[PDB]
Amino acid sequence: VLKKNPLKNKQVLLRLNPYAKVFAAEKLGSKKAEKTGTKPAAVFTETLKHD
Amino acid sequence: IVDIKANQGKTGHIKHSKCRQEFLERVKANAAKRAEAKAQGSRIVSTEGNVPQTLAP
Amino acid sequence: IDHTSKQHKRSGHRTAPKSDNVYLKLLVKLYTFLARRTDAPFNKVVLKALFLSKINRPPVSVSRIARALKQEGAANKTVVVVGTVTDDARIFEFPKTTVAALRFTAGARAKIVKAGGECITLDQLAVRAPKGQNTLILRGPRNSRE
Amino acid sequence: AHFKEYQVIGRRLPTESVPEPKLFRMRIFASNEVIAKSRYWYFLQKLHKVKKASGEIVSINQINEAHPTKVKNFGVWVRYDSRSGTHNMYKEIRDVSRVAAVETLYQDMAARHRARFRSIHILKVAEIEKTADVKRQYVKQFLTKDLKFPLPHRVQKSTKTFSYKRPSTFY
Amino acid sequence: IIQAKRDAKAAGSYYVEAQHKLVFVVRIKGINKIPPKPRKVLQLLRLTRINSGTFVKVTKATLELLKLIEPYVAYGYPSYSTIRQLVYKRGFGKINKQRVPLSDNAIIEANLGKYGILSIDDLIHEIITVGPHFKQANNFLWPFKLSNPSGGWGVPRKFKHFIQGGSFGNREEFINKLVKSMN
RNA sequence: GGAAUACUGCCAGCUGGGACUGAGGACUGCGACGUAAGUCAAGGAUGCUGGCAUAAUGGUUAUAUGCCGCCCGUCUUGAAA
RNA sequence: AAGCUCGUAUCAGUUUUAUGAGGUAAAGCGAAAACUUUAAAUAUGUAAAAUGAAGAGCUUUUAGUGGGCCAUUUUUGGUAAGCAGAACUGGCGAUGCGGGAUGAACCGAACGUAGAGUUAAGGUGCCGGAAUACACGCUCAUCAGACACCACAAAAGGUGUUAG
RNA sequence: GCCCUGAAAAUGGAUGGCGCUCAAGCGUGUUACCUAUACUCUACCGUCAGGGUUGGAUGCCCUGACGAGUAGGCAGG
Incomplete structure (x- = not known):
């Protein structure tokens, strides 16, 4: 009889998506990524900083 | 069905029509492909010898 | 709001016959129920026939009935006419048969009974063959009305 | 708008028997990358008859000021x-x-x-x-x-409709 | 994708990104004084009222259609968050020619089960990855009835190109901000 | 050489204030929390409290104030006069 | 409107694919622009992938209708200048609502009765709802300007001022 | 580029008026704000449509979408 927004109503959210619980519990919205130390090539740096 | 154009492109200064040659060829080709099937059924730009070049007005 | 089709467009199918015959309305009610609760196309055909006008329900002759029964495998089927069965003096021999119709003229009824059959109404037809089993529903010639 | 500087590198559309096109680069000042790309196509066509379909943008970067x-x-x-x-x-x-x-x-x-x-x-x-x-x-x-200059006739901003004293333009 | 860009930088190559396959289009103008060919293309894209949006798969044919309807639409490349919010809040299924809200996974399973779509997130996956059953899933989705943007259009006059300080045309990744304002 | 911050984006992160609405009417559904019992914000508002019980609310009417509103019908021509 | 038929029907004021068109001169590269092979598509046809569509085809029937005005685009012919003849497509007619102070053809948008929110076009000194906002420049008119303008007076004149 | 001249008569009058001059003018940029019978959401009325109904059926229940109009057409009062 009444449409409820899953983006506001947490019960409807869980009803439509059982994975919302795991997402919230493990904080997949704030996943800290693994680091890399790759550096751009000197030709790339010169082209970026050239006219 | 034929072509009309003085030596402006009327379909239906004349030559024979070729407006269904592709359709006929595709009909025959799809028949042959069906017989064949029934019998047995982001690029990358690198810079080694090219560099970006500053060419502006 | 930029409509691609007509708004408030009526479908076109029928619900009430223009006739105010109470018995015809009762038959229509019975066959509306039957075509709803039964997935037999015969009941839908009979229901649709129950709405046609007089000019669209031409009579069916006993000669036409007998010729229809002359088909092989169709001798023991019950013939259904949603309309009037008229007599025909051009036939001198009539088979034994069971006919369901809205109306029988006196001559046609006498001929069927004398040949040894029975004349039943469409509600008796509904009781006997609820899905219209072993039926042969006939329509009379039309272009005769010009 | 608030301008950014983009390096934009494009080239001709690759085809058969056509390797290594002429890598045309440009520096475009624009509010965003969509405008920068449109401007790049416009300037490329003006420089030489290369349509947008006849070309391809292979790189676009934002260039920050080194000593801002x-x-x-x-x-x-x-x-x-x-x-x-x-x-x-x-x-x-x-x-x-x-x-x-x-x-x-x-x-x-x-x-x-x-x-x-x-x-x-x-x-x-x-x-x-x-x-x-x-x-x-x-x-x-x-x-x-030793450059020095004054700012004569300072006009102060008033929040209210009425002031209860004459204003001074001193600085 | 991120690591491929970094690898191209490190090797000195230029990582040319994949061509976009999905576009979200919103009808921007009203239903008065539209020329017949553009209004025919709008009806074919199911954009029959202002602030109505649909997903479109990107091919040559759809590209030419978008070129035709350019003055009367704002379109761009939708993100996963935008698609997810659109489907969750304003997603309606066309079921027996009726507009039915997507309030449960059973509604989606009963009608798209033939294609292997079992839930709202499977439908979103089929949209974001323009998949084998994209036509069926996209047509199952009822055209999105968006409101006017909360915060306005950000321009004084909408009916210039986005490039020239207007609203219409291809705005690429800015469609996400616009559509989230309109959601 | 090591950071920080800006900007852009994401969170099925948290939390405060305001406004309009409360359709439906035994139960049935999909879920959430619980070892269970069961409870819940999960197929649409309930709980607690006060004043009044009449011109108080409201209606009608006359006026005032703010904004709006050209005199009807016919007949002509695209159209208006 | 009524019948008959069917509805994995039948299509489409749309795109694409293959087949044509002013070959007009920018292909590039040829036997010394005179050659004669190609190419993104402005702009129509035929026939077969995209997108959309629950109504379609046929047969009998019934009413009202039988002017045009304005504009865009292309085209042919013209004048001092206006322009005239065609074809297409829109607007208006039968049409209320927001805006342009006002209004046949301008800009938005088409309309059941209400509530809340957001906007279009247009605006935000006061009339008058809304910044006498913020920022960088220009201008001082002895009747500035606040516009119809990629229009007429308009070809120029000036010891006004600014930037080249 | 802006400014002055670059001709114009005759009742008193018009950037709509007031008025405005580092503008309340002109060019441009960035925001905020105002409000249509338009858009979103809800309630209600009607029309149409699709499902269900053997236990006022010209009804009853569930659901969805729509609502400008002259001549004219059809229906209910």
Whole structure:
């Protein structure tokens, strides 16, 4: 009889998506990524900083 | 069905029509492909010898 | 709001016959129920026939009935006419048969009974063959009305 | 808008028996990358008849100012169109970044020559390393030793409708 | 994708990104004084009222259609968050020619089960990855009835190109901000 | 050489204030929390409290104030006069 | 409107694919622009992938209708200048509502009765709802300007001012 | 580029008026704000449509979408 927004109503959210619980519990919205130390090539740096 | 154009492109200064040659060829080709099937059924730009070049007005 | 089709467009199918015959309305009610609760196309055909006008329900002759029964495998089927069965003096021999119709003229009824059959109404037809089993529903010639 | 500088590198559309196209690069001042790409296609076609379908943008980067808080004299070469023919202009702009200087130039063009962003083409922006190489006096004026000037007639902002004293314009 | 860009930088190559396959289009103008060919293309894209949006798969044919309807639409490349919010809040299924809200996974399973779509997130996956059953899933989705943007259009006059300070045309990744304002 | 910050984006992160609405009417559904019992914000508002019980609310009417509103019908021509 | 038929029907004021068209001169590269092979598509046809569509085809029937005005685009012929003849497509007619102070053809948007929110076009000194906002420049008119303008007076004149 | 001249008569009058001059003018940029019978959401009325109904059926229940109008057409009062 009444449409409820899953983006506001947490019960409807869980009803439509059982994975919302795991997402919230493990904080997949704030996943800290693994680091890399790759550096751009000197030709790339010169082209970026050239006219 | 034929072509009309003085030596402006009327379909239906004349030559024979070729407006269904592709359709006929595709009909025959799809028949042959069906017989064949029934019998047995982001690029990358690198810079080694090219560099970006500053060419502006 | 930029409509691609007509708004408030009526479908076109029928619900009430223009006739105010109470018995015809009762038959229509019975066959509306039957075509709803039964997935037999015969009941839908009979229901649709129950709405046609007089000019669209031409009579069916006993000669036409007998010729229809002359088909092989169709001798023991019950013939259904949603309309009037008229007599025909051009036939001198009539088979034994069971006919369901809205109306029988006196001559046609006498001929069927004398040949040894029975004349039943469409509600008796509904009781006997609820899905219209072993039926042969006939329509009379039309272009005769010009 | 608030301008950014983008390096844009494009090339011809690769085809069969056609390797290694001419990598055309440009520096575009624009509010965002969509406008920068459109401007790049426009300038590419003007330079040479290369349609958007006949080309492909292989790179676009944002170039930040290297020393963003150092005051720099910039010489800017531009050309712009009008009802008359295209004109070439040289201007001197004293600012801390190329994007700031380019925004100043666009506003000055709109105010003086009634020109617009679609009419101005920025040929070159370059820092003038030596003081002596400047030409325009409205820039050379701010380059003197121990520069000092007052700000006469200070007009203070009032929040309320009525003030209960006459205002002073002192500074 | 991120690591491929970094590898191209490190090797000195230029990582040319994959061509976009999905576009979200919103009808921007009203239903008065539209020329017949553009209004025919709008009806074919199911954009029959202002602030109505649909997903479109990108091919040559759809590209030419978008070129035709350019003055009357704002379109761009939708992100996963935008698609997810659109489907969750304003997703309606066309079921027996009726507009039915997507309030449960059973509604989606009963009608798209033939294609292997079992839930709202499977439908979103089929949209974001323009998949084998994209036509069926996209047509199952009822055209999105968006409101006017909360915060306005950000321009004084909408009916210029986005490039020239207007609203219409291809705005690429800015469609996400616009559509989230309109959601 | 090591950071920080800006900007852009994401969170099925948290939390405060305001406004309009409360359709439906035994139960049935999909879920959430619980070892269970069961409870819940999960197929649409309930709980607690006060004043009044009449011109108090409201209706009608006359006026005032703010904004709006050209005199009807016919007949002509695209159209208006 | 009524019948008959069917509805994995039948299509489409749309795109694409293959087949044509002013070959007009920018292909590039040829036997010394005179050659004669190609190419993104402005702009129509035929026939077969995209997108959309629950109504379609046929046969009998019934009413009202039988002028045009304005504009865009292309085209042919013209004048001092206006322009005239065609074809297409829109607007208006039968049409209320927001805006342009006002209004046949301008800009938005088409309409059941209400509530809340957001907007279009247009605006935000006061009339008058909304910044006498912020920022960079220009201008001082002895009747400035606040516009119809990629129009007429308009070809120029000036010891006004600014930037080139 | 802006400014002055670049001709114009005759009742008193018009950027709509007031008035405005680092504008309340002109060019341009960035925001905020105002409000249509338009858009979103809800309630209600009607029309149409699709499902269900053997236990006022010209009804009853569930659901969805729509609502400008002259001549004219059809229906209910």
